[PDB]
Amino acid sequence: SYCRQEGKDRIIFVTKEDHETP
Amino acid sequence: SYCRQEGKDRIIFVTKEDH
Amino acid sequence: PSHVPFLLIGGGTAAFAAARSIRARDPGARVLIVSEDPELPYMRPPLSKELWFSDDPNVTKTLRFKQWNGKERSIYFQPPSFYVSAQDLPHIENGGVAVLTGKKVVQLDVRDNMVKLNDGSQITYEKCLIATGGTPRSLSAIDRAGAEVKSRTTLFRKIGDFRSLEKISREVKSITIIGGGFLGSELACALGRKARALGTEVIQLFPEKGNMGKILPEYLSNWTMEKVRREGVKVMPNAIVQSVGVSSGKLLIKLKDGRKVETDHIVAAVGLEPNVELAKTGGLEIDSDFGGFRVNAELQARSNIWVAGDAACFYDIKLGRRRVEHHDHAVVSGRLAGENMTGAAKPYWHQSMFWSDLGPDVGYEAIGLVDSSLPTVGVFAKEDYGKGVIFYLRDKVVVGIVLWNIFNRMPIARKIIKDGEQHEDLNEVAKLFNIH
Amino acid sequence: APSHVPFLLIGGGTAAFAAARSIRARDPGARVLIVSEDPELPYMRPPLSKELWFSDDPNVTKTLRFKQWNGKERSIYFQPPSFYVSAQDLPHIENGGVAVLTGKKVVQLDVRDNMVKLNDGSQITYEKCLIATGGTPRSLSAIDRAGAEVKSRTTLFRKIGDFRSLEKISREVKSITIIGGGFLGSELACALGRKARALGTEVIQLFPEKGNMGKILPEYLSNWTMEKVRREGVKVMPNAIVQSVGVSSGKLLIKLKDGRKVETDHIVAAVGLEPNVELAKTGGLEIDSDFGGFRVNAELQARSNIWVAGDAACFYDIKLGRRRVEHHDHAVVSGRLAGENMTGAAKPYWHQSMFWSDLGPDVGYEAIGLVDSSLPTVGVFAKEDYGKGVIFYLRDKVVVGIVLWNIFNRMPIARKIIKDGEQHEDLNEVAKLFNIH
Ligand SMILES: Cc1cc2nc3c(=O)[nH]c(=O)nc-3n(C[C@H](O)[C@H](O)[C@H](O)COP(=O)(O)OP(=O)(O)OC[C@H]3O[C@@H](n4cnc5c(N)ncnc54)[C@H](O)[C@@H]3O)c2cc1C
Ligand SMILES: Cc1cc2nc3c(=O)[nH]c(=O)nc-3n(C[C@H](O)[C@H](O)[C@H](O)COP(=O)(O)OP(=O)(O)OC[C@H]3O[C@@H](n4cnc5c(N)ncnc54)[C@H](O)[C@@H]3O)c2cc1C
Ligand SMILES: NC(=O)c1ccc[n+]([C@@H]2O[C@H](COP(=O)([O-])OP(=O)(O)OC[C@H]3O[C@@H](n4cnc5c(N)ncnc54)[C@H](O)[C@@H]3O)[C@@H](O)[C@H]2O)c1
Ligand SMILES: NC(=O)c1ccc[n+]([C@@H]2O[C@H](COP(=O)([O-])OP(=O)(O)OC[C@H]3O[C@@H](n4cnc5c(N)ncnc54)[C@H](O)[C@@H]3O)[C@@H](O)[C@H]2O)c1
């Protein structure tokens, strides 16, 4: 689950189990 | 009786004869 | 038709929603819709999305399309049997909804509760809704061009424009769509499907860097542009039209970058200009920032005049002053306006959404302030922007949400918008959406 | 105090009193409750800056009475306390009445439940509500950063107590400095200059503009009025921008950006008015972003059962556009209009409001409509003596604003001229209807 910031817009990638993990 | 122009301001002096 | 209790001035989605709401709250209510178009009120999204993909040769005449469940449905909101004749509207038992087609309200007198039609007749009202929408804008180059160019240019707004554009799509080998907004992209997808069926050519160009550059962030707009390009469409971003002229018997668009566009037909989708001709006569305030009629939180302009739909610039208490040109917003604004004219005082509370399907691979829902100018935080499942959700932030507060390729997840987004919680991280908030 | 009231007016002032009068006049038996955060009953502000200072009565500061233009004299209050009823008896008194909750500030407004909550925790339900909170004097930033001694020796002038404090200071101290060349600054400068000439003290007025009423009058008229104020006994200091205020040698010392220091014993700050829009945040009411105050429509209506009148009402005039007018006559007419609309008489802003100003014996003028110095102006004057004349304000060629300069009983003509936009080409003929001579 890695992030990326472009100007005023940030994008977060999230894995299924990373989403599952509390 | 005369009219003067200062930019957007227009000043007109009139006497009694001009009513 | 001399006097009517409820008068809706623009016959469309907002007017039909307001009439239905007025009938629901007030049994026996007499509602008159004055439509300048000869057609009965109908829903517009099918004209650009669903009527094109219908598998029926008689789709021009039937004007029917299949829904998600597969049931066939007409683009008209209700059959003509639902509407009552305007002549018998004052006498029909338990009220009804009547439409006066082919009549334009040219004069609006706020102080005498009166409207004058283009034919000279005058109608007095008690509660009035200005449900006029807008008219498609025109290019400066198209307007200053000759008469042949304007003969080969269409402003896609109504059923007649749909039938015309479909006839040209069958009989013409090249179509160019000006603009990359909602209507431009939807028409591009539909015409690309038709061209792949036939083998013809479809062009779309716009000044922005991608489709819906005013709505989606730049990366998402680029992804959507790639998708519509793979829909079988020639898409030309960063295009400013200088002039258009008939060369060799076909239209020739000259761009400010020097590139030429040889085409046989032009569809201009360059925005919507709200119909505010009645404001000049009625002395109604026009919003300078957003356009359209300025109204308050209750969609109210004057004591007996409400404005709903495309031409309404309203104040949403949660998000501020807005003008939203969308079908579901038209329905919600019509519902709220009908409630208010019935005698309620509800402000704009239930946020309205909108949807767009730019091919099978692009389908999204959006709620709240979805503006490309606002900063956003996007959380996507697993360069690929297949599934996910995008949050629009004003000051650490989620003012708008784009549900990207996720369905049945709108209640969660609506709940998030309803609260003004300043979320520290939005990954935890996105966890509410099981995007995977 | 009462749980429910039909008509609830928030704020005790000119607009609220005018609204209560209109409501009671066209709706006999109405129960109107005025909630004023100040202990004083409603009173008119103009005398505090013009008339109370020129009274021959030595004890005028205690009785607050003054003589108007005719032989009769009247108090500063709109009505005596016998006019108002108690809030306890308001629901029960026959044929209604008007009540004032003095010293109670509305801190919470809820529109959906039609409810307000006061500073003491009491809650009142209303059917119709007017927000006539007016405004509060703006403060100089250099005064704020100065400290506590300067703020103790600085006066924001809007209330009766401010008048009493400033009058006592003028009787006591020698030098007084007025900051701001607008309406109140100029009026107070003239009054204090007359008082100083009576006594023999020093009065100073400084402002960033080039002349008095620079935002209202054209530059030549501003210069003429500045000279008249200067000969009224005031050391007018134009083009002065305050950067620092600091106590030195037991006296206030204003330091300006151009490098001029002004030693004084007291400072009066008249640097504009901030509309009281605190109820908007808790009530979900829109605030106009380019004029301030509550945004209302042509009928002074904000929501279903909420109207706004006075200096806090940014309204829409059909003829002249969106406006916010901070003037006594505008407060009266907007309060009357708001009360009329509150009692189910939907009518927009039609009757244009005027304002007046008397900056000494030789400067007295009236104005109606859009009177703004940035607009193009054409002035027609009798016989550089700008003694008598008329000034027209134009948007494109239509007269939107007229200043009647030292000519009186000419308001009907200017009102008719503004009412019918005729796109006048030549302006000598329209000036001819004013018998300037
Ligand atoms: C092809 C197309 C596809 C669309 N697809 C989508 C979609 O997928 N999703 C979405 O959310 N939105 C979509 N929209 C937008 C949505 O349809 C509109 O926002 C909605 O129809 C607005 O409703 P309205 O009643 O305010 O105005 P309109 O629907 O424009 O109705 C206005 C009517 O009033 C008439 N009128 C105007 N002035 C006068 C007058 N003075 N007197 C009498 N009559 C007058 C007009 O001629 C017209 O009949 C689409 C629009 C179009 C054109
Ligand atoms: C010294 C002075 C001289 C003036 N002279 C002139 C003149 O010669 N000519 C002219 O045209 N105009 C003049 N004006 C301007 C004019 O008097 C005002 O613009 C007008 O009186 C404003 O009336 P209003 O009722 O809107 O507000 P105000 O008169 O300010 O009344 C507002 C009231 O509401 C109260 N209030 C505020 N907030 C709350 C709250 N949250 N809850 C409850 N109560 C609240 C305030 O304390 C106050 O009692 C003068 C003003 C001043 C100060
Ligand atoms: N999916 C949906 O919700 C949907 C679908 C279709 C239509 N609509 C509605 O239909 C209406 C029409 O949409 P639209 O796409 O015409 O407008 P829009 O408001 O979606 O976007 C305007 C478009 O016109 C372009 N444009 C403006 N001036 C231009 C110029 N001089 N030259 C070239 N391009 C120019 C802009 O770049 C942009 O692409 C809108 O109200 C829209 O919301 C909505
Ligand atoms: N005759 C009348 O109509 C009349 C008379 C007195 C008061 N009033 C009202 O009373 C209120 C108070 O009057 P006011 O003169 O304070 O406001 P105003 O709006 O009349 O004028 C503002 C004045 O403050 C000055 N100012 C603003 N910011 C400043 C700053 N940072 N530093 C220095 N000066 C600054 C301006 O230059 C101008 O002189 C206003 O609402 C006014 O309309 C009206």
PDB file of C-alpha atoms in Angstrom, chain A residues 1-2 4 6 8-16 18-22, chain C residues 217 372-382 385 431 433-436:
ATOM      1  CA  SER A   1       0.000   0.000   0.000  1.00  0.00           C
ATOM      2  CA  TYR A   2       2.002   2.937  -1.365  1.00  0.00           C
ATOM      3  CA  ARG A   4       1.786   9.243  -4.411  1.00  0.00           C
ATOM      4  CA  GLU A   6       0.752  15.088  -7.445  1.00  0.00           C
ATOM      5  CA  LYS A   8      -3.180  19.010  -4.727  1.00  0.00           C
ATOM      6  CA  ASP A   9      -4.240  15.422  -5.532  1.00  0.00           C
ATOM      7  CA  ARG A  10      -2.943  12.433  -3.565  1.00  0.00           C
ATOM      8  CA  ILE A  11      -3.518   8.808  -4.581  1.00  0.00           C
ATOM      9  CA  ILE A  12      -3.328   5.844  -2.192  1.00  0.00           C
ATOM     10  CA  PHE A  13      -3.051   2.282  -3.468  1.00  0.00           C
ATOM     11  CA  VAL A  14      -4.455  -0.350  -1.111  1.00  0.00           C
ATOM     12  CA  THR A  15      -4.268  -4.157  -1.188  1.00  0.00           C
ATOM     13  CA  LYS A  16      -7.254  -6.383  -0.394  1.00  0.00           C
ATOM     14  CA  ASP A  18      -4.359  -4.257   3.704  1.00  0.00           C
ATOM     15  CA  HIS A  19      -7.965  -3.068   3.469  1.00  0.00           C
ATOM     16  CA  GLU A  20      -9.001  -6.108   5.521  1.00  0.00           C
ATOM     17  CA  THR A  21      -6.416  -5.457   8.247  1.00  0.00           C
ATOM     18  CA  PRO A  22      -7.984  -3.340  11.080  1.00  0.00           C
TER      19      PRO A  22
ATOM     20  CA  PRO C 217      -8.536  14.981 -11.425  1.00  0.00           C
ATOM     21  CA  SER C 372     -11.432  19.548 -10.405  1.00  0.00           C
ATOM     22  CA  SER C 373     -10.274  22.749  -8.680  1.00  0.00           C
ATOM     23  CA  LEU C 374     -10.710  21.257  -5.204  1.00  0.00           C
ATOM     24  CA  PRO C 375      -7.903  19.095  -3.797  1.00  0.00           C
ATOM     25  CA  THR C 376      -8.693  15.392  -3.756  1.00  0.00           C
ATOM     26  CA  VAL C 377      -7.580  12.166  -2.113  1.00  0.00           C
ATOM     27  CA  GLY C 378      -8.058   9.008  -4.180  1.00  0.00           C
ATOM     28  CA  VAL C 379      -7.985   5.478  -2.777  1.00  0.00           C
ATOM     29  CA  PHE C 380      -7.970   2.786  -5.464  1.00  0.00           C
ATOM     30  CA  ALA C 381      -8.092  -0.986  -5.096  1.00  0.00           C
ATOM     31  CA  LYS C 382      -4.794  -2.807  -5.684  1.00  0.00           C
ATOM     32  CA  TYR C 385      -7.415   3.273 -11.777  1.00  0.00           C
ATOM     33  CA  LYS C 431     -12.113   1.252   4.475  1.00  0.00           C
ATOM     34  CA  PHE C 433     -16.052   1.105   1.082  1.00  0.00           C
ATOM     35  CA  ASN C 434     -15.144  -2.549   0.471  1.00  0.00           C
ATOM     36  CA  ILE C 435     -13.563  -1.555  -2.830  1.00  0.00           C
ATOM     37  CA  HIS C 436     -11.865  -4.957  -3.087  1.00  0.00           C
TER      38      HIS C 436
END
